[PDB]
Amino acid sequence: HWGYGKHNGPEHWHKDFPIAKGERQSPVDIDTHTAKYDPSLKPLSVSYDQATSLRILNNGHAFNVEFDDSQDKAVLKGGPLDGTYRLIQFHFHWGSLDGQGSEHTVDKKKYAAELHLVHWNTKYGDFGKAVQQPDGLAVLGIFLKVGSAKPGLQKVVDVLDSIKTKGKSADFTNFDPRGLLPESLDYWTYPGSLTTPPLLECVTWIVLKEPISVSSEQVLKFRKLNFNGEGEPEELMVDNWRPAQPLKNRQIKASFK
């Protein structure tokens, strides 16, 4: 099945998922001098004070930190969004080297990694129904550069040894995702898709301008994860990013001047 290798990677996905060649695919290159400032855009509202993490999972493509989304707790609203979107999970995409790893690019710059905080539109009742809708998800994307450590990331880094291989999970309670945010909530936004199969065109993308800094040691520990299951030949979980896709005349809007 699909993955990130030479034989099953992004250039192959269209054979099982023909929407891969669709009109609103993600990620994209963000051309900062073509993105227009939109004074009608609102500040983003990120309300994570009551977020309740449950578990961390290696799904063979990345690791997901999962949240209890049974009540109205950790929500994203404002910005370009109508209504309220509930946090379900976050995950990352990263490289084999510090020069690559992000999915979105900024004037063709690749960051070392990219964090995706995934939220579903509460008007559709659950995530499975939301992904069938053009406004079903809002994904908050945050770039990572290598420099100073991110203290709020370390709890995640430290549990990775316990989920090395595909299908392993571990309890992961009381993790506060506020510790992964940069200082500024300035953003770009555009309509797009999931960046992994099934590539559904259901996402309002909100990409923060300000990267977070993580240490070399932190990202090195991401690169010790495995795509394979326990008892299978080791293949390091690196370069789990889809490259930029055609913009197809979509407009990217900026919240800032």
Ligand SMILES: [N]S(=O)(=O)[C][C][C][C]C123[B@]45[B@]67[B@@]89[C@@]1%10B81%11B698B746B814B562B%10%1143
């Ligand atoms: N990389 S990304 O931020 O565009 C979303 C990555 C996985 C998308 C999924 B959607 B909901 B949850 C997870 B499971 B289920 B369906 B299934 B597809 B995958």
Ligand SMILES: [Zn+2]
């Ligand atoms: Zn993602």
